[PDB]
Write a protein that binds this DNA or RNA. Structure first.
Ligand SMILES: [K+]
Ligand SMILES: [Mg+2]
Ligand SMILES: [Mg+2]
Ligand SMILES: [Mg+2]
Ligand SMILES: [Mg+2]
Ligand SMILES: [Mg+2]
Ligand SMILES: [Mg+2]
Ligand SMILES: [Mg+2]
Ligand SMILES: [Mg+2]
Ligand SMILES: [Mg+2]
Ligand SMILES: [Mg+2]
Ligand SMILES: [Mg+2]
Ligand SMILES: [Mg+2]
Ligand SMILES: [Mg+2]
Ligand SMILES: [Mg+2]
Ligand SMILES: [Mg+2]
Ligand SMILES: [Mg+2]
Ligand SMILES: [Mg+2]
Ligand SMILES: [Mg+2]
Ligand SMILES: [Mg+2]
Ligand SMILES: [Mg+2]
Ligand SMILES: [Mg+2]
Ligand SMILES: [Mg+2]
Ligand SMILES: [Mg+2]
Ligand SMILES: [Mg+2]
Ligand SMILES: [Mg+2]
Ligand SMILES: [Mg+2]
Ligand SMILES: [Mg+2]
Ligand SMILES: [Mg+2]
Ligand SMILES: [Mg+2]
Ligand SMILES: [Mg+2]
Ligand SMILES: [Mg+2]
Lengths: 208, 246, 132, 126, 116
RNA sequence: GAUUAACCCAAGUCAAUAGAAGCCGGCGUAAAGAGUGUUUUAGAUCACCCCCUCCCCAAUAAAGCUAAAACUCACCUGAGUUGUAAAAAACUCCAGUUGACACAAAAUAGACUACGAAAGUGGCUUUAACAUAUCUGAACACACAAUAGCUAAGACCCAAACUGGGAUUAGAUACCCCACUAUGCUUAGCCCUAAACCUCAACAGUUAAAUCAACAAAACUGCUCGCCAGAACACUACGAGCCACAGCUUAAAACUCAAAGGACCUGGCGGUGCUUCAUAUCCCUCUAGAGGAGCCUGUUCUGUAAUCGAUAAACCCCGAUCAACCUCACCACCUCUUGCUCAGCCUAUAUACCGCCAUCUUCAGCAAACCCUGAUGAAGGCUACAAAGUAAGCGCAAGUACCCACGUAAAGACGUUAGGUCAAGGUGUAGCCCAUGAGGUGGCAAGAAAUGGGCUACAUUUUCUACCCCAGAAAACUACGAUAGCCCUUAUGAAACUUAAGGGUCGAAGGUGGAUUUAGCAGUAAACUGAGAGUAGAGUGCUUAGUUGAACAGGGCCCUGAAGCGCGUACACACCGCCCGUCACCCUCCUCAAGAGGAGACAAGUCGUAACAUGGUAAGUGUACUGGAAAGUGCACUUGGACGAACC
């Protein structure tokens, strides 16, 4: 890295700097005073202080990117969100008054809830023992869990099974399905959970 | 190089009583410091640093080891910790060196005035191969002209427009300053980054010092040193090696 | 291991001059160029002819002054003037040195069709930078 | 290390030399290299503690025996006086005893130098 | 401390040897390293509760939320406890002293199985 | 070997043979304390005065008894139990509880060190009982002697050679699992062997020194007995003795060799221990690929009259930043002979080299000169509350280049691989001189097959068009997909079916690729664009500039390595090491009913890998059974293995 180790990652949060001094604790005050003497990396172009910034959606867009084509990936993401919102509006209008309250129309909430539902709880690690390889169930960190959800969503949307269907439409359909706890990705999570439950007897093989 | 004088006379008798230790200067220094500590026992930071081992060797005209330097520095710190007098402080200050604490505070551009009397600040920025020179006026409607073109026409990508929005929005000054920036070189994103850096640097002249510090901490005023890495011979790219066959 | 123009280490008895003691990667960093002409500059020609002239001059001076040269020659080209600055040893009689100076200067002038001067700096012995 | 400072001070006061730090290998048997070809080695070495800090004989005892330097030495009941030229059996741990030894040796050296100066002055006078 | 008189096979010892050590019974000037304890699989009980609830609820997370949260909390506690255990091993509070400091102490006072 | 010279002796020289010259030395590991105890004849002075553990703990034989755990039986519950790295086989008259329950074996005590001559002896009780008022002493006897084994009769819970089955394996006559027998136990006889070793004889005495090869368990003295005298043949043959009959004890010789051996030093290595790490990295991970398709290009193989070299990491768009003629060194034919050169050779040798480099190195050590330790051996040389190291110099580092102090370059020693290049050039040695030299003309440089690296794709995050990011169409046999095939034109050139570019025509394999595998930690990977070197022209290649621009970066010592401390070592060109046994020929010797066996040498090929590292099942002794073979297993014993050496 061209940044010396002295450099620190910048913190982009307006509320963090607009916080009143009186509310600040001694630890926070000391941290703020110390940060005046450190070196700070340049703010990355990906993230800004815009109120419409979503780190989850930015990460999903980066994972969808192919060959550094972030314009196309961002276009696909915004088209997917627009398609989700349009489908939700269509369902809202076509539904009765009772069902209108339950129908969700925020694409961001739908996306976050779909990823949260797609998140696996217990993973499998291949462990060598006695010359064999065993799929030992293991706990998963939240980071790996979110990454697995995102990667499963993207891989399922990129599957060749869907013919001539554009990525925004496929991704919107999968997001709506996952938001309702249905679809191939939720089935993949269930299959992982079932395999872990079956291999539960191998859990003692783990040494960590 | 500084050379130590002959350490014994015609008769052969060495001048210093610690000659046969082989490190008479260092051990004499340690002896004096220990004696000062004993005297102090009998009686009962930011702008300075301890000298490095090389400085101590230059002072003593004797080769030293890292552990010897550690022992000396520990003894000096123990000397400082006590209720030292004026002479005991002068002895310490003999070895203490001065460190220039360069302020990380961003330099504020002077506020210049045009023919019409409007106030403005000019700055420059670089991102990869892109160089941008920006002028930010104290009063404005938020209009930004890039090479005489509106920034929404010049930047048809939402990411670049968000990059432009970042400095003003971070200090809650959207639509309050008019900007005229000329950028040359690099791609669209490098140009947007350079314009962002120049705009933030210029806008520092019209915000409070705390706001300038916040912008610096947010990364709006650091010149991004990340530039393209040269391709090396014998490998496909900057880091990509040729496929290796075993 | 790189071998180019490197005097390898030994038991510490081999004397090396400043020119020899520095590896090629020290050129323009710790040592200069033994020939100075405008041939290799951008937008210039006749570089190959200048290189061939330099090679021939070095070989000719090495052969004409056997065992006298104490270091590499320094060739300078100003206009059509060709200056050869050479560090020689104080062993030959000055009569022979002057004879060789006149001889080489006239021969090179009539060979390369340019005024050639030969400046000799004499040293009692080879200048030693270090012992490798 | 309890008496390094006292012994160094005594050596400085009496005009003689002291070694109370880690005895580097060869300070006596390799002095011509460490110091120089014209270094003058001590003509008498006085050990106020013949044992090193790991309860073995000080290497300087053996090295001074090699270099034919007579060694005066205070030897406790756990020391080895075989190679010490003039061993003095005595306690080497109590501060009182060590101070007594330092006083006696310093006074003897000072009296010797005073007598040498007096004899030289008297012989020049006559 | 067990007696060593008449144990080893030595001249003048009439009886057959009691001890046959493969190394001399002489104290070394160093102690063994701080041996790690082989890690065991953790949070197995909470994992079992979660998996049994999955089997009873057809792997529906909505019904099993409580047990799933318990298992996740146990996993996070186990990871943080492993990190804290590494920190404690660096600290060395649990033992009477770290092996490094003990080795330093033994270096200061070495064993002397020889004469001098 | 000849030749020149030299050396020794000399009327001799010296090839063969024989003789002369050998016991006061040792026995823990080199061969050697005989498995143990006790005599007479004898020997010794350690006998007498004169004496400090007498006695008790697990000596021995006999008789009796039994606490825990088994087996079996009985009731009641369940359909499983056993088995391990994982399984299978096996048993379900099985498993669990409870109760009854032995000719088997004797937790804890034992952190004790006792008894016995040794072998051995560690549950309890009782009886008998543990020689010698100097010492050594029997291999010419007498009496004992672990385990194994034989004989005869019994017991039989459990274990277990053999055997059978299951598994593993290339095979598995083993390791792993299951069942069972001889056997382990009792009684009466035999057998008489052990790494029967504490490899250290009994008795008396010393710690004085001249302590002392090394390691081990310090060095010795007096006396006596036993044993030993290069290795292998050889715990063998013959003879003799024995209750032993495939046996045990004593025990040679011939052929052969210049060694064998014991203990160490250093290094390497270990399917070696502990600890800490790996930061594109060893594993799980993240991204893009390779391996599947077509094409370009290199290589192997085949082919031709037709180069050469690299060819594991460290070869394979490599010498070439480049072969149509030239280049060219290849082949065929023709020609010249002091030849462009005070000749020439791209002839052999890179295992003679210089020159330039690869590689560990994505290391950090190399080393002059001294000094000290090892008893002055090979060797080694550090502890900071410091204990023998000091060290010039090279390297790292620092400085320097690009955009910083970061990063990338560059650098990167001594050495390793007799690593690459004799074809850059030079050059040692050897080789040709009417040719292995020089010139001219023409020509090969292909693909049965296999493979490496790239390029293009297999499309919808796509294809075409405009634009360079607010669009319109296409979207499966006229879709995506050739830079390929065929035809034509142009460029260069003297020469283009051949090289390049363009146009036309065609629209192929292919539908995200098995085992396996490469690279990347940030402006990096990925994708896109441009320029340069060299050419007359020529690469999908190389060098280089820029643009858009990510994901993971957290856990682990399980896998592979590194470092620190050790351990082992029969290896030392150093584990790609060494090494064992069976199955052919020849040679020598020995024992032989001349057929054959044995030993050694010769040393092959074959089948395994038994030993040396925890040698991948620790090794070995005795013994029994079994096996193609080293060998496997049972039982007891040994360390000539280790168990990491405070607690954790
Ligand atoms: K390929
Ligand atoms: Mg290199
Ligand atoms: Mg004392
Ligand atoms: Mg022996
Ligand atoms: Mg015996
Ligand atoms: Mg007797
Ligand atoms: Mg027996
Ligand atoms: Mg039986
Ligand atoms: Mg059984
Ligand atoms: Mg079995
Ligand atoms: Mg019994
Ligand atoms: Mg035994
Ligand atoms: Mg036998
Ligand atoms: Mg026999
Ligand atoms: Mg017989
Ligand atoms: Mg392929
Ligand atoms: Mg070839
Ligand atoms: Mg070849
Ligand atoms: Mg040709
Ligand atoms: Mg030729
Ligand atoms: Mg070579
Ligand atoms: Mg480099
Ligand atoms: Mg460097
Ligand atoms: Mg070779
Ligand atoms: Mg070769
Ligand atoms: Mg020819
Ligand atoms: Mg075409
Ligand atoms: Mg033409
Ligand atoms: Mg083996
Ligand atoms: Mg084995
Ligand atoms: Mg065995
Ligand atoms: Mg068997």
């Amino acid at each position: 890295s061209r940044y010396s180790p002295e450099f620190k990652d910048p913190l982009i949060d307006k509320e963090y700097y607009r916080k009143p001094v009186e509310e600040l604790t001694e630890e926070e005050k000391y941290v703020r005073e110390l940060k005046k003497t450190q070196l700070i990396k340049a703010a990355p172009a990906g993230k800004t202080s815009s109120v419409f910034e979503d780190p989850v959606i930015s990460k999903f867009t980066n994972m969808m990117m192919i060959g550094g084509n972030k314009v196309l990936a961002r276009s696909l993401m915004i088209q997917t969100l627009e398609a989700v919102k349009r489908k939700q509006f269509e369902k809202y209008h076509a539904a009765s008054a009772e069902e209108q309250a339950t129908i969700e129309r925020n694409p961001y909430t739908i996306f976050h809830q779909a990823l949260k539902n797609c998140e696996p709880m217990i993973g499998l690690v291949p462990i060598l023992k006695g010359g064999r390889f065993y799929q030992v169930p293991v706990p998963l960190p939240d980071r790996r869990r979110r990454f697995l959800a995102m990667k499963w969503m993207i891989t399922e949307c990129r599957d060749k099974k869907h013919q001539r269907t554009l990525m925004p439409e496929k991704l919107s359909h999968k997001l709506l399905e996952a938001f309702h706890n249905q679809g191939p990705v939720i089935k993949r999570k269930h299959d992982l959970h079932k395999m872990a439950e079956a291999n539960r007897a191998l859990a003692h093989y783990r040494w960590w | 190089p500084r050379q130590r004088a002959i350490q014994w006379g015609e008769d052969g008798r060495p001048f210093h009583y610690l000659f046969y230790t082989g490190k008479q200067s260092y051990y004499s220094l340690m002896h004096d410091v220990y004696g000062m500590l004993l005297n102090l026992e009998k009686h009962q930071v930011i702008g300075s640093r301890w000298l490095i081992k090389e400085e101590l060797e230059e002072m003593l005209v004797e080769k030293l080891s890292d552990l010897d330097y550690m022992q000396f520095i520990r003894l000096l710190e123990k000397l400082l910790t006590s209720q030292c007098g004026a002479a005991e402080e002068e002895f310490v200050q003999r070895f203490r060196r001065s460190v220039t604490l360069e302020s990380k505070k961003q330099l504020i551009e002077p506020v210049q005035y045009d023919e019409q009397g409007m106030a403005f600040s000019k700055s420059e920025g670089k991102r990869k191969t892109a160089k941008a020179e920006a002028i930010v006026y104290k009063h404005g409607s938020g209009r930004i002209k890039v090479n005489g073109i509106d920034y929404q026409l010049y930047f048809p990508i939402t990411q670049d427009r968000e990059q432009l929005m970042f400095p003003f929005h971070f200090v809650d000054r959207l639509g309050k300053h008019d900007v005229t920036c000329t950028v040359s070189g690099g791609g669209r994103s490098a140009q947007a980054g350079a314009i962002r850096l120049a705009m933030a640097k210029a806008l520092c002249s019209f915000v409070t010092e705390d706001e300038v510090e916040w912008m610096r901490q947010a990364g709006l005023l650091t010149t991004d040193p990340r530039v393209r890495e040269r391709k090396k011979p014998g490998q496909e790219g900057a880091r990509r090696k040729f496929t290796w066959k075993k | 291991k790189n071998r180019a123009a490197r005097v390898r280490v030994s038991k510490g008895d081999k004397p090396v001059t400043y020119e020899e003691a520095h590896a090629p990667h020290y050129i323009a960093h710790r040592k200069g160029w033994l020939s100075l002409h405008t041939g290799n500059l951008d937008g210039e020609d006749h570089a190959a002819e200048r290189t061939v002239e330099d090679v021939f001059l070095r070989k000719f001076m090495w052969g004409t002054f056997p065992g006298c040269l104490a270091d590499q020659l320094v060739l300078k080209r100003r206009g059509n003037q060709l200056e050869i600055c050479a560090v020689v040893l104080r062993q030959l009689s000055p009569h022979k040195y002057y004879f060789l100076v006149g001889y080489s200067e006239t021969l090179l002038s009539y060979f390369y069709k340019c005024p050639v001067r030969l400046h000799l700096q004499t040293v009692p012995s080879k200048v030693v930078y270090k012992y490798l | 290390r309890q008496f390094s400072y006292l012994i160094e001070n005594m050596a400085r006061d009496c005009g003689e030399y002291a070694h109370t730090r880690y005895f580097r290998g060869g300070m006596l048997t390799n002095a011509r290299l460490l110091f120089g070809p014209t270094v003058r080695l001590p003509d008498l070495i006085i050990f106020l503690h013949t044992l090193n800090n790991i309860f073995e004989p000080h290497v300087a005892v053996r090295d001074a025996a090699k270099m034919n330097i007579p060694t005066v030495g205070i030897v406790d009941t756990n020391c080895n006086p075989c190679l010490i030229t003039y061993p003095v059996p005595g306690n080497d741990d109590s501060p009182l005893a060590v101070h007594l030894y330092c006083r006696l040796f310093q006074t003897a050296i000072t009296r010797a130098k005073e007598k040498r100066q007096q004899v030289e002055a008297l012989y020049r006078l006559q | 401390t067990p007696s060593l008189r008449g144990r080893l096979a030595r001249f003048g010892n009439p009886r057959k040897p009691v001890l046959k050590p493969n190394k001399p019974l002489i104290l070394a000037n160093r102690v063994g390293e701080r041996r790690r304890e082989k890690g065991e699989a953790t949070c197995i009980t909470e994992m079992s509760v979660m998996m049994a609830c999955w089997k009873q609820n057809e792997f529906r997370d909505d019904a099993c939320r409580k047990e799933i949260q318990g298992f996740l909390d146990c996993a996070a506690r186990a990871q943080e406890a492993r990190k804290m255990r590494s920190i404690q091993e660096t600290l060395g509070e649990s033992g009477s002293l770290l092996p490094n400091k003990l080795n330093k102490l033994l270096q200061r006072f070495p064993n002397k199985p020889y004469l001098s």
